[PDB]
Design a protein around this motif. Structure first.
Motif, mmCIF file in Angstrom:
data_model
loop_
_atom_site.group_PDB
_atom_site.id
_atom_site.type_symbol
_atom_site.label_atom_id
_atom_site.label_comp_id
_atom_site.label_asym_id
_atom_site.label_seq_id
_atom_site.Cartn_x
_atom_site.Cartn_y
_atom_site.Cartn_z
ATOM 1 N N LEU A 158 35.052 36.107 42.806
ATOM 2 C CA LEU A 158 35.710 37.350 42.642
ATOM 3 C C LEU A 158 34.813 38.328 41.910
ATOM 4 C CD1 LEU A 158 39.305 38.184 41.353
ATOM 5 C CD2 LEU A 158 37.326 39.340 40.552
ATOM 6 N N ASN A 159 34.510 39.476 42.503
ATOM 7 C CA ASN A 159 33.677 40.503 41.859
ATOM 8 C C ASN A 159 34.581 41.657 41.599
ATOM 9 O OD1 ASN A 159 31.715 38.647 42.899
ATOM 10 N ND2 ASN A 159 30.484 40.280 43.747
ATOM 11 N N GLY A 160 34.527 42.176 40.404
ATOM 12 C CA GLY A 160 35.351 43.284 40.080
ATOM 13 C C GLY A 160 34.835 44.190 39.004
ATOM 14 N N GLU A 161 35.645 45.200 38.769
ATOM 15 C CA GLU A 161 35.287 46.397 38.098
ATOM 16 C C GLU A 161 36.605 46.957 37.630
ATOM 17 O OE1 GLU A 161 32.474 50.111 38.263
ATOM 18 O OE2 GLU A 161 32.348 48.783 40.060
ATOM 19 N N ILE A 162 36.655 47.194 36.330
ATOM 20 C CA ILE A 162 37.733 47.891 35.747
ATOM 21 C C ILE A 162 37.225 48.951 34.773
ATOM 22 C CG2 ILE A 162 38.021 46.029 34.046
ATOM 23 C CD1 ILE A 162 41.044 46.885 34.119
ATOM 24 N N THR A 192 42.687 44.926 45.464
ATOM 25 C CA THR A 192 41.887 43.801 45.757
ATOM 26 C C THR A 192 41.825 43.619 47.221
ATOM 27 O OG1 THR A 192 43.587 41.904 45.639
ATOM 28 C CG2 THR A 192 42.557 42.545 43.551
ATOM 29 N N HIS A 193 40.714 43.053 47.660
ATOM 30 C CA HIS A 193 40.492 42.714 49.036
ATOM 31 C C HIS A 193 40.099 41.238 49.025
ATOM 32 C CE1 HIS A 193 39.353 43.012 53.206
ATOM 33 N NE2 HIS A 193 38.255 42.358 52.873
ATOM 34 N N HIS A 194 40.655 40.370 49.876
ATOM 35 C CA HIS A 194 40.379 38.948 49.817
ATOM 36 C C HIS A 194 40.011 38.443 51.198
ATOM 37 C CE1 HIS A 194 43.403 38.074 46.329
ATOM 38 N NE2 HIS A 194 43.564 39.354 46.601
ATOM 39 N N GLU A 195 38.910 37.698 51.347
ATOM 40 C CA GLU A 195 38.597 37.027 52.584
ATOM 41 C C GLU A 195 38.663 35.537 52.248
ATOM 42 O OE1 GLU A 195 36.720 36.960 56.602
ATOM 43 O OE2 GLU A 195 38.676 36.255 55.836
ATOM 44 N N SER A 245 37.479 31.739 48.852
ATOM 45 C CA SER A 245 38.006 33.064 48.812
ATOM 46 C C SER A 245 36.913 33.901 48.230
ATOM 47 C CB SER A 245 39.276 33.126 47.875
ATOM 48 O OG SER A 245 39.731 34.482 47.546
ATOM 49 N N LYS A 246 36.500 34.945 48.932
ATOM 50 C CA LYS A 246 35.602 35.946 48.405
ATOM 51 C C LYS A 246 36.548 37.130 48.206
ATOM 52 C CE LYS A 246 30.722 36.800 49.106
ATOM 53 N NZ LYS A 246 30.516 36.483 47.638
#
Length: 229
Positions: free
Chosen positions: A17-21, A101-104, A114-115
């Motif tokens: 999981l890559n994210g940004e807040i 969020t976007h999940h593959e 899950s990416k």
């Protein structure tokens, strides 16, 4: 072999999981165990330091194919396999910010990977998401309805419990789209009862969580179906 036949237990999971807040880039990785239909966990960890948001709020971003469905309702998430599906999620923490969020997913070798990407802006830095002041989220029911020619929509309202004992609401709205680009039979409208439990392993030194979801589907309101076409 396909759909339910592909989900023989036990199975496992990984997640990246890559994210940004609020501009703070961060990343989370994890692995987990799914011993049986409807019970599935995830041991996850921030690989970039501290997680800059509450682990409670990130719980929903951290596998609906593992939900338990009765035989009398289509398991859409499973029937998407082979081919998989994606999930777009929007979560509005009312009074505070909003995150997407976007999940593959892919499934190989008894393991769903899950990416997932996460963007979150305009959060109150003195608010509970950013100060990490939540203790847990209460169980709830996710409403699932047909969407477009080949999707489903999931909506829910989530009660987040703060340290001071009060509730903040998040409203959540997701679209699920098969990307096997083939027809998947959509289900009747129904509900998915969902509970999240989070623990700490103090034998892990990284910022981390051990999370179990229990997820059961049901025809809670037999009438609901007639309202959707």
């Amino acid at each position: 072999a396909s759909g339910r036949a592909l989900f023989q237990y036990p199975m496992t999971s990984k997640i990246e999981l890559n994210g940004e807040i609020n501009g703070k880039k961060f990343k989370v990785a994890g692995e987990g165990f799914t011993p049986s239909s409807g019970r599935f966990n995830m041991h996850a960890y921030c690989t970039t330091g501290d997680l800059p948001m509450s682990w409670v709020v990130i719980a929903s971003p951290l596998f609906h194919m593992f939900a338990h469905y009765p035989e009398d309702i289509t398991h859409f998430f499973q029937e998407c396999f082979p081919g998989s599906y994606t999930l777009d999620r929007t979560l509005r923490m009312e009074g505070d910010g909003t995150l997407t969020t976007h999940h593959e997913y892919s499934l190989e070798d008894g393991c769903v990977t899950s990416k997932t990407t996460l963007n979150a802006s305009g959060f109150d830095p003195k608010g509970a998401t950013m100060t990490k002041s939540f203790v847990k989220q209460l169980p709830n029911e996710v409403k699932i309805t047909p969407h477009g020619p080949n999707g489903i929509r999931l909506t829910s309202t989530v009660l987040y419990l703060k340290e001071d004992g009060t509730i903040q609401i998040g409203t959540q709205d997701c679209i699920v789209t098969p990307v096997g680009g083939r027809k998947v039979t959509q289900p009747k409208a129904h509900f998915l009862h969902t509970q999240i439990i989070q623990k700490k392993d103090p034998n892990d030194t990284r910022d981390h969580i051990v999370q179990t979801e229990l997820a059961v589907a049901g025809n809670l309101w037999h009438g609901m179906d007639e309202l959707y076409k």
